[PDB]
Amino acid sequence: TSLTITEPEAFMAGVLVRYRKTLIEKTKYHLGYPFNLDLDYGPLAELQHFAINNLGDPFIESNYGVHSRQFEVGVLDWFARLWEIEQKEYWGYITNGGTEGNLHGILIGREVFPDGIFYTSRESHYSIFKAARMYRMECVKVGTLINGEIDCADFKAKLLSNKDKPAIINLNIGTTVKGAVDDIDLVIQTLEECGFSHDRFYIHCDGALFGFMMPFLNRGPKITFKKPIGSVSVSGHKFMGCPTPCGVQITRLEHINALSRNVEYLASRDATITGSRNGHSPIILWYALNRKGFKGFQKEVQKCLRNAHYLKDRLREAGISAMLNELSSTVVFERPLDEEFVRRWQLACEGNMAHVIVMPNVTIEKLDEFLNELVQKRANWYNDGKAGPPCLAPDIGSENCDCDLHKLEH
Amino acid sequence: TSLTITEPEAFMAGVLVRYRKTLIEKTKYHLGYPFNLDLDYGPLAELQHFAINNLGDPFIESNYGVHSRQFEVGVLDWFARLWEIEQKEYWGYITNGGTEGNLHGILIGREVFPDGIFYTSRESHYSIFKAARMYRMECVKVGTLINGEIDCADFKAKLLSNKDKPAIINLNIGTTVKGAVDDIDLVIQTLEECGFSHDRFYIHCDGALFGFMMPFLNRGPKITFKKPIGSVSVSGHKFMGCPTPCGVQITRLEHINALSRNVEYLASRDATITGSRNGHSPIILWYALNRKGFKGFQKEVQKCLRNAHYLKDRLREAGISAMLNELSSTVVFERPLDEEFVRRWQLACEGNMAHVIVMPNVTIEKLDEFLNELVQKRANWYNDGKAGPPCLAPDIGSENCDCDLHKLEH
Ligand SMILES: [Ca+2]
Ligand SMILES: [Ca+2]
Ligand SMILES: [Zn+2]
Ligand SMILES: [Zn+2]
């Protein structure tokens, strides 16, 4: 459905009204992807009048004056507080998304250790493997437990067979498909007891969704630069919500010296992946953090976990295979067989799993509308004498599978 | 000037009114950077209500439904027509800027030729060298004529000393500082006559500013995939104008197969540098191309060249060193000595050069306000018996220098 451009009104603002309609509709039924669709930023749309560009370092003002560094630096300072690094220990910037933050953090680690072996789990986001290939790093794929966590036994095994070289590591704070959280503490411990001291490994934390969310609980492996991590990224258009993709990458200031170069025509430094940078995003994220604070976010997070547990419980009671990890708003379940149902609710699918990500816009009323439809349609899919439901035990563990075999065991 | 975030109105919408004021002011006096500040996109700011995300390939719809691919594909088709490649010969996407397009095009070339030597001029944008380092390519810096063009003699010399390996080449369609245009035709010719056939070289065209502008003249070395180029990038927030940085990268479809990988949870492919992608940009660029067409752009371009020639002429008549290349809106001139004057007009500086880029928002009335101030202040800078003006002959040629020595020669 492409929309051809013709040489020279009505036809154009006609299109905006129709498109706006299809977006309202798509927004109503969206469940599959970790994007917060509850956007409360109406006062800021004045600013679409200016060409805001934070071109260069956030902490060194370029000669391009139409920028939002006041906001950007505010937001970054908040993130530094959130992850416990002090003003004079940290560098970072507001990115174009979680994949830019991954490319930045992995690049930083390659520069700390050019001979470094790179390690990540099999359930790392495609951005991580893209980065290693772009960067010509040796990528060792570490195995994974049933639930998605990195397997620190297989990790240990792999560390010891490359004991000469330093270790560069990506950890998944909330894997894309299953919503697992790599055990930072155990990973650190495993390194130390294979004779990797702090000065022979670099850890990047990919927290595109859950990295934002986890500091608002009193639970789980804390993300803090008091541990020997190297950098942490988050996507701003995931939990916080932002009309355009953005994110936040924060690293140790010591680490940024190897990337940072003066660029005379900016009167700034280039330590970012990008050149020109979105300067609306920093304002949008500043507005949100201010309106809501750590209390407003903690609420939204706790309600999202509650609503995911609800969804999971309702699915199990309908005898549909489903899992929800401890620290997660990602409900993995039996992949709907009706692919037009998949497209209507915009579900992400891998193999025999689909998932719903319960973002602030995802309400109980909306989960019920969905469970209604899914249950009605499921009845026509696996009726005798057709094959009967797929077994998700290999994906989510047999405790969570409700196929013909595993429903009996519970 | 950072802006601290505090836990919970007036204080916030107070800030927006003050910030909006400083942006109006900064927009009034901006001359140094290639950003079109004449933004006519008021009807589209409704859409800041949606989380538009073109996540994945522009031509394969992902399951995330809140996207602008209708627009994106329209815009890309227009660019394909503009650079003369047919619907079934080309792939491309709307990027986050000219640096993403550079990283994409250089990556494509590295995959066509993994053993390839990379060549660019000394006056390539910092993005180009950043890419080669990120990508661990061998970068051979080719020398440059006075005016900024790549020196195809020094090119030839360098080609022949690496005659075994294939050649990957970046060409600067409008260099950042001086506004030069690498001679594509001559570069091609030089390759052919050093025994590089089409299947042993890849050319990327960096056209962040002037790549958009040049097809609207009947002059200069035409950008066309009928010649053996590999890819062309442009920045959308440069000439066309866009509140957020964006761009357009177009390559040959044959070339994209080496990067493109299916990602099951998108139900799309990943052939981009990025993951999540701005889906407002494609709409903004679609609106602009439609309102104005090839006629509206041709006008804006011709007026920008006219206004640059004006600025240059006025500068020479005040006996201020200045150059304007043939195919350029970039007026290079004696770097103001008053750095607060530099910051007031937001000029980009390198060495003894500054420059004004004459973008559609840059009017004659505004150029005159600037020439007035510059001329008044210049009188206090080089009065006897202080040193007298710097010599820009090494930078811009002695025909364009008006120092104490070279002003005599003309
Ligand atoms: Ca329960
Ligand atoms: Ca003239
Ligand atoms: Zn089973
Ligand atoms: Zn001179």
mmCIF file with all atom_site columns, C-alpha atoms in Angstrom, chain A residues 48-228:
data_model
loop_
_atom_site.group_PDB
_atom_site.id
_atom_site.type_symbol
_atom_site.label_atom_id
_atom_site.label_alt_id
_atom_site.label_comp_id
_atom_site.label_asym_id
_atom_site.label_entity_id
_atom_site.label_seq_id
_atom_site.pdbx_PDB_ins_code
_atom_site.Cartn_x
_atom_site.Cartn_y
_atom_site.Cartn_z
_atom_site.occupancy
_atom_site.B_iso_or_equiv
_atom_site.pdbx_formal_charge
_atom_site.auth_seq_id
_atom_site.auth_comp_id
_atom_site.auth_asym_id
_atom_site.auth_atom_id
_atom_site.pdbx_PDB_model_num
ATOM 1   C CA . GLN A 1 48  ? 7.859  20.655  15.850 1.00 0.00 ? 48  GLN A CA 1
ATOM 2   C CA . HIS A 1 49  ? 8.220  24.198  14.461 1.00 0.00 ? 49  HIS A CA 1
ATOM 3   C CA . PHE A 1 50  ? 11.985 24.189  15.226 1.00 0.00 ? 50  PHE A CA 1
ATOM 4   C CA . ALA A 1 51  ? 14.831 22.123  13.748 1.00 0.00 ? 51  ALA A CA 1
ATOM 5   C CA . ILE A 1 52  ? 16.198 20.979  17.121 1.00 0.00 ? 52  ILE A CA 1
ATOM 6   C CA . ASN A 1 53  ? 19.500 19.158  16.727 1.00 0.00 ? 53  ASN A CA 1
ATOM 7   C CA . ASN A 1 54  ? 21.822 18.152  19.603 1.00 0.00 ? 54  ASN A CA 1
ATOM 8   C CA . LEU A 1 55  ? 24.602 17.593  17.084 1.00 0.00 ? 55  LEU A CA 1
ATOM 9   C CA . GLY A 1 56  ? 27.754 16.671  19.024 1.00 0.00 ? 56  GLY A CA 1
ATOM 10  C CA . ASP A 1 57  ? 28.483 15.875  22.676 1.00 0.00 ? 57  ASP A CA 1
ATOM 11  C CA . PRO A 1 58  ? 25.609 16.537  25.138 1.00 0.00 ? 58  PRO A CA 1
ATOM 12  C CA . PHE A 1 59  ? 28.065 18.179  27.618 1.00 0.00 ? 59  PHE A CA 1
ATOM 13  C CA . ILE A 1 60  ? 30.005 20.352  25.082 1.00 0.00 ? 60  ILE A CA 1
ATOM 14  C CA . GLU A 1 61  ? 27.762 22.907  23.324 1.00 0.00 ? 61  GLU A CA 1
ATOM 15  C CA . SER A 1 62  ? 28.235 22.995  19.517 1.00 0.00 ? 62  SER A CA 1
ATOM 16  C CA . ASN A 1 63  ? 27.893 26.283  17.614 1.00 0.00 ? 63  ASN A CA 1
ATOM 17  C CA . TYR A 1 64  ? 24.528 25.087  16.305 1.00 0.00 ? 64  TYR A CA 1
ATOM 18  C CA . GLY A 1 65  ? 22.292 26.968  18.696 1.00 0.00 ? 65  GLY A CA 1
ATOM 19  C CA . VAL A 1 66  ? 18.871 25.303  18.045 1.00 0.00 ? 66  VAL A CA 1
ATOM 20  C CA . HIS A 1 67  ? 19.307 22.438  20.542 1.00 0.00 ? 67  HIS A CA 1
ATOM 21  C CA . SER A 1 68  ? 17.838 20.905  23.729 1.00 0.00 ? 68  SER A CA 1
ATOM 22  C CA . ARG A 1 69  ? 20.959 20.133  25.781 1.00 0.00 ? 69  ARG A CA 1
ATOM 23  C CA . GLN A 1 70  ? 19.409 21.705  28.914 1.00 0.00 ? 70  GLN A CA 1
ATOM 24  C CA . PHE A 1 71  ? 16.796 18.910  28.800 1.00 0.00 ? 71  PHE A CA 1
ATOM 25  C CA . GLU A 1 72  ? 19.149 16.217  27.503 1.00 0.00 ? 72  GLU A CA 1
ATOM 26  C CA . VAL A 1 73  ? 21.589 16.726  30.369 1.00 0.00 ? 73  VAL A CA 1
ATOM 27  C CA . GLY A 1 74  ? 18.793 16.802  32.940 1.00 0.00 ? 74  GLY A CA 1
ATOM 28  C CA . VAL A 1 75  ? 17.510 13.418  31.637 1.00 0.00 ? 75  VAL A CA 1
ATOM 29  C CA . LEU A 1 76  ? 20.982 11.924  31.569 1.00 0.00 ? 76  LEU A CA 1
ATOM 30  C CA . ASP A 1 77  ? 21.621 13.072  35.158 1.00 0.00 ? 77  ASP A CA 1
ATOM 31  C CA . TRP A 1 78  ? 18.443 11.369  36.297 1.00 0.00 ? 78  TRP A CA 1
ATOM 32  C CA . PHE A 1 79  ? 19.503 8.149   34.567 1.00 0.00 ? 79  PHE A CA 1
ATOM 33  C CA . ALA A 1 80  ? 22.932 8.408   36.236 1.00 0.00 ? 80  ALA A CA 1
ATOM 34  C CA . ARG A 1 81  ? 21.231 8.721   39.633 1.00 0.00 ? 81  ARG A CA 1
ATOM 35  C CA . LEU A 1 82  ? 18.868 5.812   38.748 1.00 0.00 ? 82  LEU A CA 1
ATOM 36  C CA . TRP A 1 83  ? 21.851 3.515   37.969 1.00 0.00 ? 83  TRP A CA 1
ATOM 37  C CA . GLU A 1 84  ? 24.079 4.950   40.726 1.00 0.00 ? 84  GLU A CA 1
ATOM 38  C CA . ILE A 1 85  ? 26.972 6.660   38.907 1.00 0.00 ? 85  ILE A CA 1
ATOM 39  C CA . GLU A 1 86  ? 28.133 10.148  39.956 1.00 0.00 ? 86  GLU A CA 1
ATOM 40  C CA . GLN A 1 87  ? 28.121 13.297  37.721 1.00 0.00 ? 87  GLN A CA 1
ATOM 41  C CA . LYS A 1 88  ? 31.915 13.113  37.331 1.00 0.00 ? 88  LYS A CA 1
ATOM 42  C CA . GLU A 1 89  ? 32.128 9.371   36.731 1.00 0.00 ? 89  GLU A CA 1
ATOM 43  C CA . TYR A 1 90  ? 29.665 9.038   33.816 1.00 0.00 ? 90  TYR A CA 1
ATOM 44  C CA . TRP A 1 91  ? 29.159 9.922   30.160 1.00 0.00 ? 91  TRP A CA 1
ATOM 45  C CA . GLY A 1 92  ? 26.154 9.209   27.988 1.00 0.00 ? 92  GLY A CA 1
ATOM 46  C CA . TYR A 1 93  ? 23.640 10.563  25.477 1.00 0.00 ? 93  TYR A CA 1
ATOM 47  C CA . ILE A 1 94  ? 20.108 10.286  24.235 1.00 0.00 ? 94  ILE A CA 1
ATOM 48  C CA . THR A 1 95  ? 20.131 7.896   21.240 1.00 0.00 ? 95  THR A CA 1
ATOM 49  C CA . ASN A 1 96  ? 17.769 7.007   18.381 1.00 0.00 ? 96  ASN A CA 1
ATOM 50  C CA . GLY A 1 97  ? 16.874 3.744   20.132 1.00 0.00 ? 97  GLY A CA 1
ATOM 51  C CA . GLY A 1 98  ? 18.007 0.616   21.889 1.00 0.00 ? 98  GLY A CA 1
ATOM 52  C CA . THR A 1 99  ? 19.928 -0.596  18.844 1.00 0.00 ? 99  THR A CA 1
ATOM 53  C CA . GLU A 1 100 ? 22.101 2.542   18.764 1.00 0.00 ? 100 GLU A CA 1
ATOM 54  C CA . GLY A 1 101 ? 22.747 2.064   22.502 1.00 0.00 ? 101 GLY A CA 1
ATOM 55  C CA . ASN A 1 102 ? 23.791 -1.530  21.850 1.00 0.00 ? 102 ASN A CA 1
ATOM 56  C CA . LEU A 1 103 ? 26.100 -0.478  19.001 1.00 0.00 ? 103 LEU A CA 1
ATOM 57  C CA . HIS A 1 104 ? 27.630 2.192   21.231 1.00 0.00 ? 104 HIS A CA 1
ATOM 58  C CA . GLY A 1 105 ? 28.166 0.025   24.297 1.00 0.00 ? 105 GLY A CA 1
ATOM 59  C CA . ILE A 1 106 ? 29.593 -2.893  22.314 1.00 0.00 ? 106 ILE A CA 1
ATOM 60  C CA . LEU A 1 107 ? 31.932 -0.521  20.473 1.00 0.00 ? 107 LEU A CA 1
ATOM 61  C CA . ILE A 1 108 ? 33.137 0.930   23.751 1.00 0.00 ? 108 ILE A CA 1
ATOM 62  C CA . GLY A 1 109 ? 33.978 -2.608  24.966 1.00 0.00 ? 109 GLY A CA 1
ATOM 63  C CA . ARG A 1 110 ? 35.817 -3.442  21.747 1.00 0.00 ? 110 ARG A CA 1
ATOM 64  C CA . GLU A 1 111 ? 37.997 -0.382  22.295 1.00 0.00 ? 111 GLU A CA 1
ATOM 65  C CA . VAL A 1 112 ? 38.701 -1.231  25.956 1.00 0.00 ? 112 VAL A CA 1
ATOM 66  C CA . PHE A 1 113 ? 39.686 -4.741  24.648 1.00 0.00 ? 113 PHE A CA 1
ATOM 67  C CA . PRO A 1 114 ? 40.460 -4.943  20.858 1.00 0.00 ? 114 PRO A CA 1
ATOM 68  C CA . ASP A 1 115 ? 41.427 -8.622  21.200 1.00 0.00 ? 115 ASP A CA 1
ATOM 69  C CA . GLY A 1 116 ? 38.388 -9.334  23.458 1.00 0.00 ? 116 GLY A CA 1
ATOM 70  C CA . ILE A 1 117 ? 36.078 -12.259 22.781 1.00 0.00 ? 117 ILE A CA 1
ATOM 71  C CA . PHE A 1 118 ? 32.424 -11.191 22.701 1.00 0.00 ? 118 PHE A CA 1
ATOM 72  C CA . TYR A 1 119 ? 29.846 -13.251 24.628 1.00 0.00 ? 119 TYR A CA 1
ATOM 73  C CA . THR A 1 120 ? 26.039 -13.081 24.557 1.00 0.00 ? 120 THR A CA 1
ATOM 74  C CA . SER A 1 121 ? 23.138 -15.503 24.991 1.00 0.00 ? 121 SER A CA 1
ATOM 75  C CA . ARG A 1 122 ? 21.349 -17.274 22.134 1.00 0.00 ? 122 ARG A CA 1
ATOM 76  C CA . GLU A 1 123 ? 18.297 -15.091 23.019 1.00 0.00 ? 123 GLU A CA 1
ATOM 77  C CA . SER A 1 124 ? 20.065 -11.781 22.520 1.00 0.00 ? 124 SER A CA 1
ATOM 78  C CA . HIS A 1 125 ? 18.307 -9.254  20.273 1.00 0.00 ? 125 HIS A CA 1
ATOM 79  C CA . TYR A 1 126 ? 19.329 -9.290  16.574 1.00 0.00 ? 126 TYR A CA 1
ATOM 80  C CA . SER A 1 127 ? 20.953 -5.867  17.198 1.00 0.00 ? 127 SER A CA 1
ATOM 81  C CA . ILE A 1 128 ? 23.681 -7.570  19.276 1.00 0.00 ? 128 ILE A CA 1
ATOM 82  C CA . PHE A 1 129 ? 24.744 -10.003 16.556 1.00 0.00 ? 129 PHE A CA 1
ATOM 83  C CA . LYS A 1 130 ? 24.452 -7.259  13.924 1.00 0.00 ? 130 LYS A CA 1
ATOM 84  C CA . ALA A 1 131 ? 26.900 -5.190  16.004 1.00 0.00 ? 131 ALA A CA 1
ATOM 85  C CA . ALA A 1 132 ? 29.513 -7.980  16.328 1.00 0.00 ? 132 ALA A CA 1
ATOM 86  C CA . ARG A 1 133 ? 29.451 -8.539  12.575 1.00 0.00 ? 133 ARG A CA 1
ATOM 87  C CA . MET A 1 134 ? 29.575 -4.819  11.812 1.00 0.00 ? 134 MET A CA 1
ATOM 88  C CA . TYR A 1 135 ? 32.455 -4.563  14.249 1.00 0.00 ? 135 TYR A CA 1
ATOM 89  C CA . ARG A 1 136 ? 34.214 -7.784  13.163 1.00 0.00 ? 136 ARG A CA 1
ATOM 90  C CA . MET A 1 137 ? 34.265 -9.184  16.694 1.00 0.00 ? 137 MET A CA 1
ATOM 91  C CA . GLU A 1 138 ? 34.377 -12.899 17.477 1.00 0.00 ? 138 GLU A CA 1
ATOM 92  C CA . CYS A 1 139 ? 30.958 -13.741 18.856 1.00 0.00 ? 139 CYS A CA 1
ATOM 93  C CA . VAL A 1 140 ? 30.598 -16.720 21.208 1.00 0.00 ? 140 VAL A CA 1
ATOM 94  C CA . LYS A 1 141 ? 26.881 -17.576 21.610 1.00 0.00 ? 141 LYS A CA 1
ATOM 95  C CA . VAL A 1 142 ? 26.242 -18.707 25.169 1.00 0.00 ? 142 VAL A CA 1
ATOM 96  C CA . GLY A 1 143 ? 23.430 -21.154 25.834 1.00 0.00 ? 143 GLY A CA 1
ATOM 97  C CA . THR A 1 144 ? 20.228 -20.321 27.679 1.00 0.00 ? 144 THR A CA 1
ATOM 98  C CA . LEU A 1 145 ? 17.985 -21.933 30.326 1.00 0.00 ? 145 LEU A CA 1
ATOM 99  C CA . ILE A 1 146 ? 14.361 -22.809 29.448 1.00 0.00 ? 146 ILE A CA 1
ATOM 100 C CA . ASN A 1 147 ? 13.082 -19.426 30.580 1.00 0.00 ? 147 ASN A CA 1
ATOM 101 C CA . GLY A 1 148 ? 15.546 -17.317 28.510 1.00 0.00 ? 148 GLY A CA 1
ATOM 102 C CA . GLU A 1 149 ? 18.254 -16.418 31.096 1.00 0.00 ? 149 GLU A CA 1
ATOM 103 C CA . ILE A 1 150 ? 21.905 -16.850 30.087 1.00 0.00 ? 150 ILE A CA 1
ATOM 104 C CA . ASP A 1 151 ? 23.235 -20.229 31.281 1.00 0.00 ? 151 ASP A CA 1
ATOM 105 C CA . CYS A 1 152 ? 26.209 -19.296 33.515 1.00 0.00 ? 152 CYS A CA 1
ATOM 106 C CA . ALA A 1 153 ? 27.424 -22.921 33.491 1.00 0.00 ? 153 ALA A CA 1
ATOM 107 C CA . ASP A 1 154 ? 27.739 -22.867 29.684 1.00 0.00 ? 154 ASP A CA 1
ATOM 108 C CA . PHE A 1 155 ? 29.144 -19.349 30.149 1.00 0.00 ? 155 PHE A CA 1
ATOM 109 C CA . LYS A 1 156 ? 31.838 -20.705 32.522 1.00 0.00 ? 156 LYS A CA 1
ATOM 110 C CA . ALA A 1 157 ? 32.619 -23.561 30.128 1.00 0.00 ? 157 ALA A CA 1
ATOM 111 C CA . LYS A 1 158 ? 33.069 -21.003 27.300 1.00 0.00 ? 158 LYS A CA 1
ATOM 112 C CA . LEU A 1 159 ? 35.084 -18.490 29.374 1.00 0.00 ? 159 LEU A CA 1
ATOM 113 C CA . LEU A 1 160 ? 37.661 -21.174 30.318 1.00 0.00 ? 160 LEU A CA 1
ATOM 114 C CA . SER A 1 161 ? 38.261 -22.256 26.684 1.00 0.00 ? 161 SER A CA 1
ATOM 115 C CA . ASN A 1 162 ? 39.266 -18.623 25.896 1.00 0.00 ? 162 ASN A CA 1
ATOM 116 C CA . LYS A 1 163 ? 41.179 -17.860 29.086 1.00 0.00 ? 163 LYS A CA 1
ATOM 117 C CA . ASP A 1 164 ? 44.016 -15.968 27.341 1.00 0.00 ? 164 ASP A CA 1
ATOM 118 C CA . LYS A 1 165 ? 41.811 -13.160 25.934 1.00 0.00 ? 165 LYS A CA 1
ATOM 119 C CA . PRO A 1 166 ? 39.692 -10.555 27.847 1.00 0.00 ? 166 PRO A CA 1
ATOM 120 C CA . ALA A 1 167 ? 35.930 -10.946 27.845 1.00 0.00 ? 167 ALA A CA 1
ATOM 121 C CA . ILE A 1 168 ? 33.406 -8.541  26.356 1.00 0.00 ? 168 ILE A CA 1
ATOM 122 C CA . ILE A 1 169 ? 29.881 -9.402  27.470 1.00 0.00 ? 169 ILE A CA 1
ATOM 123 C CA . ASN A 1 170 ? 26.367 -8.355  26.580 1.00 0.00 ? 170 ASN A CA 1
ATOM 124 C CA . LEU A 1 171 ? 23.705 -9.116  29.194 1.00 0.00 ? 171 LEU A CA 1
ATOM 125 C CA . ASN A 1 172 ? 20.053 -9.062  28.346 1.00 0.00 ? 172 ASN A CA 1
ATOM 126 C CA . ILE A 1 173 ? 18.000 -7.199  30.902 1.00 0.00 ? 173 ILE A CA 1
ATOM 127 C CA . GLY A 1 174 ? 14.686 -8.440  29.508 1.00 0.00 ? 174 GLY A CA 1
ATOM 128 C CA . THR A 1 175 ? 15.134 -10.613 26.425 1.00 0.00 ? 175 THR A CA 1
ATOM 129 C CA . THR A 1 176 ? 12.918 -9.781  23.462 1.00 0.00 ? 176 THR A CA 1
ATOM 130 C CA . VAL A 1 177 ? 10.909 -12.986 23.166 1.00 0.00 ? 177 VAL A CA 1
ATOM 131 C CA . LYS A 1 178 ? 10.596 -14.476 26.697 1.00 0.00 ? 178 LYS A CA 1
ATOM 132 C CA . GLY A 1 179 ? 11.224 -11.486 28.936 1.00 0.00 ? 179 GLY A CA 1
ATOM 133 C CA . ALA A 1 180 ? 14.116 -13.104 30.830 1.00 0.00 ? 180 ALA A CA 1
ATOM 134 C CA . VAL A 1 181 ? 16.674 -11.217 32.914 1.00 0.00 ? 181 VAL A CA 1
ATOM 135 C CA . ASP A 1 182 ? 20.305 -12.373 32.756 1.00 0.00 ? 182 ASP A CA 1
ATOM 136 C CA . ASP A 1 183 ? 21.674 -12.815 36.282 1.00 0.00 ? 183 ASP A CA 1
ATOM 137 C CA . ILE A 1 184 ? 24.258 -10.001 36.475 1.00 0.00 ? 184 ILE A CA 1
ATOM 138 C CA . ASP A 1 185 ? 25.575 -11.004 39.926 1.00 0.00 ? 185 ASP A CA 1
ATOM 139 C CA . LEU A 1 186 ? 26.092 -14.630 38.916 1.00 0.00 ? 186 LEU A CA 1
ATOM 140 C CA . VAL A 1 187 ? 27.780 -13.568 35.661 1.00 0.00 ? 187 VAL A CA 1
ATOM 141 C CA . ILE A 1 188 ? 30.153 -11.296 37.568 1.00 0.00 ? 188 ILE A CA 1
ATOM 142 C CA . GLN A 1 189 ? 30.872 -14.048 40.116 1.00 0.00 ? 189 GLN A CA 1
ATOM 143 C CA . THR A 1 190 ? 31.502 -16.585 37.302 1.00 0.00 ? 190 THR A CA 1
ATOM 144 C CA . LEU A 1 191 ? 34.077 -14.259 35.710 1.00 0.00 ? 191 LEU A CA 1
ATOM 145 C CA . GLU A 1 192 ? 35.908 -13.667 39.010 1.00 0.00 ? 192 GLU A CA 1
ATOM 146 C CA . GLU A 1 193 ? 36.144 -17.396 39.722 1.00 0.00 ? 193 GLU A CA 1
ATOM 147 C CA . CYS A 1 194 ? 37.505 -18.185 36.240 1.00 0.00 ? 194 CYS A CA 1
ATOM 148 C CA . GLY A 1 195 ? 40.270 -15.650 36.982 1.00 0.00 ? 195 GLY A CA 1
ATOM 149 C CA . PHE A 1 196 ? 38.857 -12.628 35.125 1.00 0.00 ? 196 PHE A CA 1
ATOM 150 C CA . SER A 1 197 ? 39.524 -9.570  37.246 1.00 0.00 ? 197 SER A CA 1
ATOM 151 C CA . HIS A 1 198 ? 37.628 -6.291  36.696 1.00 0.00 ? 198 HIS A CA 1
ATOM 152 C CA . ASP A 1 199 ? 40.355 -5.132  34.273 1.00 0.00 ? 199 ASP A CA 1
ATOM 153 C CA . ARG A 1 200 ? 39.923 -8.118  31.905 1.00 0.00 ? 200 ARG A CA 1
ATOM 154 C CA . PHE A 1 201 ? 36.178 -7.940  31.208 1.00 0.00 ? 201 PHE A CA 1
ATOM 155 C CA . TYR A 1 202 ? 33.629 -5.325  30.007 1.00 0.00 ? 202 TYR A CA 1
ATOM 156 C CA . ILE A 1 203 ? 29.868 -5.813  30.546 1.00 0.00 ? 203 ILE A CA 1
ATOM 157 C CA . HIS A 1 204 ? 27.176 -4.017  28.528 1.00 0.00 ? 204 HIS A CA 1
ATOM 158 C CA . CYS A 1 205 ? 23.587 -4.199  29.768 1.00 0.00 ? 205 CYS A CA 1
ATOM 159 C CA . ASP A 1 206 ? 20.925 -4.242  27.054 1.00 0.00 ? 206 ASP A CA 1
ATOM 160 C CA . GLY A 1 207 ? 17.875 -2.988  28.945 1.00 0.00 ? 207 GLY A CA 1
ATOM 161 C CA . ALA A 1 208 ? 15.816 -1.674  26.038 1.00 0.00 ? 208 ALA A CA 1
ATOM 162 C CA . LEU A 1 209 ? 12.554 -2.400  27.894 1.00 0.00 ? 209 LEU A CA 1
ATOM 163 C CA . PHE A 1 210 ? 13.186 -3.836  31.322 1.00 0.00 ? 210 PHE A CA 1
ATOM 164 C CA . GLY A 1 211 ? 16.351 -1.861  32.151 1.00 0.00 ? 211 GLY A CA 1
ATOM 165 C CA . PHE A 1 212 ? 14.103 1.148   32.701 1.00 0.00 ? 212 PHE A CA 1
ATOM 166 C CA . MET A 1 213 ? 11.573 -0.866  34.705 1.00 0.00 ? 213 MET A CA 1
ATOM 167 C CA . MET A 1 214 ? 13.737 -2.921  37.052 1.00 0.00 ? 214 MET A CA 1
ATOM 168 C CA . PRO A 1 215 ? 15.081 -0.092  39.371 1.00 0.00 ? 215 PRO A CA 1
ATOM 169 C CA . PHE A 1 216 ? 11.462 0.564   40.368 1.00 0.00 ? 216 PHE A CA 1
ATOM 170 C CA . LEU A 1 217 ? 11.210 -2.783  42.174 1.00 0.00 ? 217 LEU A CA 1
ATOM 171 C CA . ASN A 1 218 ? 12.844 -3.814  45.458 1.00 0.00 ? 218 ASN A CA 1
ATOM 172 C CA . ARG A 1 219 ? 13.679 -7.189  43.753 1.00 0.00 ? 219 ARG A CA 1
ATOM 173 C CA . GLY A 1 220 ? 16.010 -8.881  41.244 1.00 0.00 ? 220 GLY A CA 1
ATOM 174 C CA . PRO A 1 221 ? 19.682 -8.214  40.201 1.00 0.00 ? 221 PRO A CA 1
ATOM 175 C CA . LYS A 1 222 ? 20.222 -4.458  40.666 1.00 0.00 ? 222 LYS A CA 1
ATOM 176 C CA . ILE A 1 223 ? 21.639 -2.422  37.756 1.00 0.00 ? 223 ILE A CA 1
ATOM 177 C CA . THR A 1 224 ? 24.284 -0.239  39.341 1.00 0.00 ? 224 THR A CA 1
ATOM 178 C CA . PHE A 1 225 ? 27.704 0.991   38.322 1.00 0.00 ? 225 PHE A CA 1
ATOM 179 C CA . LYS A 1 226 ? 28.823 0.043   41.867 1.00 0.00 ? 226 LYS A CA 1
ATOM 180 C CA . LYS A 1 227 ? 29.115 -3.355  40.236 1.00 0.00 ? 227 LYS A CA 1
ATOM 181 C CA . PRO A 1 228 ? 31.728 -3.659  37.429 1.00 0.00 ? 228 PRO A CA 1
#
